[PDB]
Amino acid sequence: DLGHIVKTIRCLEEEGHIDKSFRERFLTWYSLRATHREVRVVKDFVETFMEDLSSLGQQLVDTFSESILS
Amino acid sequence: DLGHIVKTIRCLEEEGHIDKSFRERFLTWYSLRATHREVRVVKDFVETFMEDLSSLGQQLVDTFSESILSKR
């Protein structure tokens, strides 16, 4: 998920909620120094975010489909 | 709200849930044919996601600032 983690942090930062300095320090730390437990914990965060993000995708697709097909 | 919708769709794009066509197709509908209710529904879903991102933002910062900063 080393690509997935970049895409999550990027996503958070792109929409506000995280600043540039934190994103680049986070990704340096994640890639070089985070311990196996610390990588598990971040993986939970990204999984929560992936399920949040997918839910919203289905809402928007379903909203759009319902408006067109009705 | 529009900027939140566009940047959200990007976040959907990069993870590949959504097909390529959806962005232009959804934005054209959202901006040009969505009823007052459909527009409200779209903003409300996107605010509920923004609130998930804000909470997740703070939880990432609070949980890991020490481990990140301590190693310089």
Q: Measured between CB atoms, which of B26, B34, B56 is closest to A48?
A: B56
Annotate A12-65 with DSSP letters as a single string. Answer: HHHTSSS-HHHHHHHHHHHHHT--HHHHHHHHHHHHHHHHHHHHHHHHHHHHHH
Is the torsion defined by CA of A15, A17, A22, A26 positive or negative? negative
DSSP B33: T
Cross-chain residue pair B11–A60, CB shorter than 8 Å:
no
Nearest by CB to B59, which of A9, A22, A45? Answer: A45
Between A and B, how many CB-CB pairs are < 8 A?
A: 103
Residues of B in contact with A53 (CB under 8 A): 11-12, 15, 17, 49
For an interface test with A, give the residue of B5, B7, B9, B15 to mutate (most A CBs within 10 A): B15
Closest CA to A26 of A47, A5, A54, A55: A5
Tally of CB atoms within 10 A around B59: 12
